[PDB]
Amino acid sequence: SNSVLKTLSGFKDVYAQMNNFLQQTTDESRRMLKDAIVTQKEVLAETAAQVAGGNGEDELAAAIAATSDIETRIDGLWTLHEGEQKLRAETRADLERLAAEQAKINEEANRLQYAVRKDENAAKTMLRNAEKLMRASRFYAEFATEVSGAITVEEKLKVAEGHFPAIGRTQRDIFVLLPKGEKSLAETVNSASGAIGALIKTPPGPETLAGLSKYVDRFRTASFRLEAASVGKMREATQIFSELDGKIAGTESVLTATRRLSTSLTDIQIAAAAFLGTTSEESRKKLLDRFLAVQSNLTTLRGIASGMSFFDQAAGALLPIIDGMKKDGLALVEITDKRTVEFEAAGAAINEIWSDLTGFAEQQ
Amino acid sequence: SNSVLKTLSGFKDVYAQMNNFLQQTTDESRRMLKDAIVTQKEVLAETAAQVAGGNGEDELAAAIAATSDIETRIDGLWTLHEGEQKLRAETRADLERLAAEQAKINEEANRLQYAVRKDENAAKTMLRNAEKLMRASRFYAEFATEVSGAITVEEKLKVAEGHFPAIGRTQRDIFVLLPKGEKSLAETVNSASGAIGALIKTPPGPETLAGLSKYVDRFRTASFRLEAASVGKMREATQIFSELDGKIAGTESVLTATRRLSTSLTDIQIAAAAFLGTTSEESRKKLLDRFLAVQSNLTTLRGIASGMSFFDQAAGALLPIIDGMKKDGLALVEITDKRTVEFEAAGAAINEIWSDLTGFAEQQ
Ligand SMILES: [Yb+3]
Ligand SMILES: [Yb+3]
Ligand SMILES: [Yb+3]
Ligand SMILES: [Yb+3]
Ligand SMILES: [Yb+3]
Ligand SMILES: [Yb+3]
Ligand SMILES: [Yb+3]
Ligand SMILES: [Yb+3]
Ligand SMILES: [Yb+3]
Ligand SMILES: [Yb+3]
Ligand SMILES: [Yb+3]
Ligand SMILES: [Yb+3]
Ligand SMILES: [Yb+3]
Ligand SMILES: [Yb+3]
Ligand SMILES: [Yb+3]
Ligand SMILES: [Yb+3]
Ligand SMILES: [Yb+3]
Ligand SMILES: [Yb+3]
C-alpha cells in the first residue's frame, strides 16, 4: 500500500514534467520529463512486487505499458515542435527579407517622384515666365489706356498713382526675363517707377503732361514687345513639354506601378502576421492571395520597367522569397496541426494512465 | 513517516498547479492551485500530529507558514496578469483604431492625387493640341518647301510621295482641332491626301504640276494659319495653367504631407508591434518617438490643410488615441514588470518550501 502511494506520487512527478514539456517545449523540459519517466517505471516496478490476478487480472500492466509507450513518443513530439519553430523562424526571416526589399522599392518610388517633378517643372517654369511677361504686357497697356484716357492732368496723375505700385512690382517680376537684345525696353521698365513716381509727387506743372504722355507711349511700345516675349516663352514651353511628355508619362506609369507593388508588399506583411499569429490553412490561403497580388504587380511593372535595373533586381530578390514562403507556409500549417494533435493525444495518454493507476489504488 | 510522504506528495500537487498558474494564468488555473493549497495545508496539518522540538525546533512551521503566505498572494498575482492582458488588449484595439484612420488618410491621398492629375491635365491637353497644330504647320511648310524646291515633275512627285503618309496622319491628328471659322483650311487638310495621292499615282501629264503648285500654295497658307492656331492654344494653356497653378501647388503640398503622415502611422504600427512583442521601457520609448513623429506630421498638415475637413477629423480621431496609448504604454511596461517579478518571487516561495519540507523528510 505504501508502495502504491509511491507509484501514484512518483507518477505526479511525471504529470508535471509532461505538462511542462507540452505547455513549453524546452529541451530541458524534455530531459526532465524523460528522467521523471525512467525513475517512475523504476518505482512502478518495485510496486510490481505485489501481484494479484496475474495475466487474468492486471491493471498495472496498463500503466507500465503506457509509461513505456509514452516515453517512446517524447523525442518525436519534440522534433515536431522543434520543426514548427524552425518554420516560424524562417517565416519571420523572410518577412524581414521582404521588408528590406519594400524599402528599396520605396526609395525608388521617391527617386521617380522626384524625377517626374523635376521634368514637369521645366515647362512649368517656362509657363510661369510666359505669364509674367503677359501680365507685364497687360499692365503697361492698362496704364497707357487709362492714363491717356484721362483728360486733365489731375486725373492723369490720379490714375498714374493707382497704378504706381504695380510699376515696380512689374519691374522686379520681369527684370531677369527681359530680352537682353532690347535696351530701350530695359530703360522703360526700370526707369518707369522713378519717373512716373516723381511726376506724381511733383506738383502739376508745365511738361508734367508731356512726361506722362511720353511714358504712356513708352508703355504701349513695351506692352507689344512684352507680349511678343511672352509668346516666345510659350513657344519654348510647348517644345520642352512635347519633348519630355513621353518621359514623364512613362515615369508616372512606373511610379504608379511601384506604389501599387509596395502596397501589396505591405499587404503581405499584414496577412503574414495574421498567419503567424493564427496558423490555420485559412490564414495560409489569405496570405497566398497577397502573394499572387505581389506577383501580378511585379509582372505589370515588368512590362513598363523591363530593363529598369531596380525592377530586375527587385523581381530577382522578391520572387524566390515568395516561392519559398508559399511552400514553407503549407509545411507550417501541417507540422502545426500534427504538433497540436500529437500533443493532445500525448496528454490523453497521461490521463488514461492516471485513470488506470487511480484504479489499482481504488482496488487497494 | 507515511505522513511525511503524504505531505511531500500532496505538496507536489501544489507545485504543479502553481507552475500552471504561472506558465499560464487561466482562471481555472488559479482555482485549481487554490484548491490544491487548502487541501495541502489540510494534509500538512495531519502531519502536524508528529511533534519534535516544538518552538525550540520546528521546520514544518516554515512550510505551513509559507503555504499560508503564498495562498494570500494568488489573487493579487492574477489581477496583475489580468491587468497586463487588459492593457495589451487595448493596445491592439487602439492599433486597429489607428489602422482604420490610416485607411481614410490613404483614400484621401488618392483623392488628392487624382485631383492634381485632373487639374495638371487641363493645360497638358491644351499644350498637346498646341503642338499638334504646330507640327501640322511645320509639316505643310516642309512640303511646300521641298516640293516647290524640286524642279522637274518627276522629283516633285517623288518628294510628294515621301510626304504622302504624313498628309493623312496630319489630317487625323488635327481634324478636331481645326478652327471651325476657317473653311478653306478645312478643305485643304482633308482634301489634301486624296488630291496629292491621285497626282502621285496619275502619270506625269499636263497640269500635274499646276495641281502640285496649287497645293504647294494651299499648304503655305495652311501652315501660317495652323501656326496661328497653335499659338492660340498656347495662349489658352498659359491662362489655364496660371489659373490652376496655385490650386495644384497647394494640393501637391497637402498630398505630400498626407503621404508623410500615413508613413509615420505605419511606423507606429511597426514600433507598437515590437513593443507588444517585447514590452520593455526601451521599446516603449521607441514607440513614443513614432508617436511624436505622427504628432508633428499632423501639425504640419494642420497649417496647409487648416479647414480641410478630412484633416480636422483625422486629428480629431488620431490625437486622443495617441494620448491614451502614451499613458497605457507606461502602465503596461510597469504592470508587466511587476507581473514578472512577483511571478518570480512566487515561484521562489514554492521552492523555499520544497527545500524546507525536503528538510523534514531528510530529518525523518
Ligand atoms: Yb542538467
Ligand atoms: Yb541547470
Ligand atoms: Yb504631380
Ligand atoms: Yb486698363
Ligand atoms: Yb484693371
Ligand atoms: Yb480698368
Ligand atoms: Yb477698366
Ligand atoms: Yb530560406
Ligand atoms: Yb484502461
Ligand atoms: Yb469546475
Ligand atoms: Yb471543467
Ligand atoms: Yb505628377
Ligand atoms: Yb522641309
Ligand atoms: Yb524633314
Ligand atoms: Yb528636309
Ligand atoms: Yb531638309
Ligand atoms: Yb481606450
Ligand atoms: Yb528555510
Side-chain angles (χ1 to χ4, degrees), chain B residues 33-50:
Chain B
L33 178 273
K34 276 209 319 218
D35 288 358
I37 281 285
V38 56
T39 71
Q40 183 55 10
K41 56 185 221 160
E42 268 168 34
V43 161
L44 177 155
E46 264 55 15
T47 286
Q50 159 188 335

Side-chain angles (χ1 to χ4, degrees), chain A residues 199-212:
Chain A
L199 275 54
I200 298 193
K201 318 286 182 203
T202 311
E207 319 320 305
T208 52
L209 295 55
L212 290 198

Side-chain angles (χ1 to χ4, degrees), chain A residues 159-178:
Chain A
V159 167
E161 177 107 6
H163 289 310
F164 171 78
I167 314 198
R169 279 177 29 214
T170 285
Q171 187 280 328
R172 279 127 37 184
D173 219 21
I174 276 73
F175 171 44
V176 310
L177 282 48
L178 291 175

Side-chain angles (χ1 to χ4, degrees), chain B residues 59 62 352-353 355-357:
Chain B
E59 305 95 288
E352 81 80 41
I353 186 154
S355 90
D356 288 18
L357 122 168

Side-chain angles (χ1 to χ4, degrees), chain B residues 260-261 264 267 288-298:
Chain B
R260 223 223 188 259
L261 185 72
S264 43
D267 295 351
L288 190 57
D289 292 352
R290 269 60 186 190
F291 277 150
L292 305 175
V294 165
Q295 281 182 297
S296 286
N297 290 194
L298 274 136

Side-chain angles (χ1 to χ4, degrees), chain B residues 80 83-88 90-91 275 279-281 284 323-339:
Chain B
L80 225 63
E84 173 203 18
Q85 290 312 120
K86 289 201 214 300
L87 283 189
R88 300 171 61 76
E90 178 142 326
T91 297
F275 181 56
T279 306
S280 75
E281 188 104 355
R284 186 204 131 259
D323 258 311
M325 308 196 22
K326 296 159 133 193
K327 317 196 218 92
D328 291 11
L330 266 151
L332 183 69
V333 152
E334 258 169 11
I335 208 159
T336 290
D337 301 325
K338 283 200 191 134
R339 196 233 47 232

Side-chain angles (χ1 to χ4, degrees), chain A residues 2 5 9 12-13 23 113 117 120 124 127-128 131 227 234-235 238 241 245 252 259, chain B residues 2 5 9 12-13 23 113 117 120 124 127-128 131 227 234-235 238 241 245 252 259:
Chain A
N2 203 95
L5 142 288
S9 181
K12 285 206 213 128
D13 277 342
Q23 60 134 314
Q113 178 85 106
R117 299 306 180 51
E120 208 137 49
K124 277 180 183 334
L127 267 176
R128 285 184 217 302
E131 177 82 355
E227 182 175 32
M234 300 177 53
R235 281 162 169 287
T238 309
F241 184 58
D245 188 22
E252 267 181 12
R259 289 231 196 81
Chain B
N2 203 95
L5 142 288
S9 181
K12 285 206 213 128
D13 277 342
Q23 60 134 314
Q113 178 85 106
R117 299 306 180 51
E120 208 137 49
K124 277 180 183 334
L127 267 176
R128 285 184 217 302
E131 177 82 355
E227 182 175 32
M234 300 177 53
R235 281 162 169 287
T238 309
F241 184 58
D245 188 22
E252 267 181 12
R259 289 231 196 81

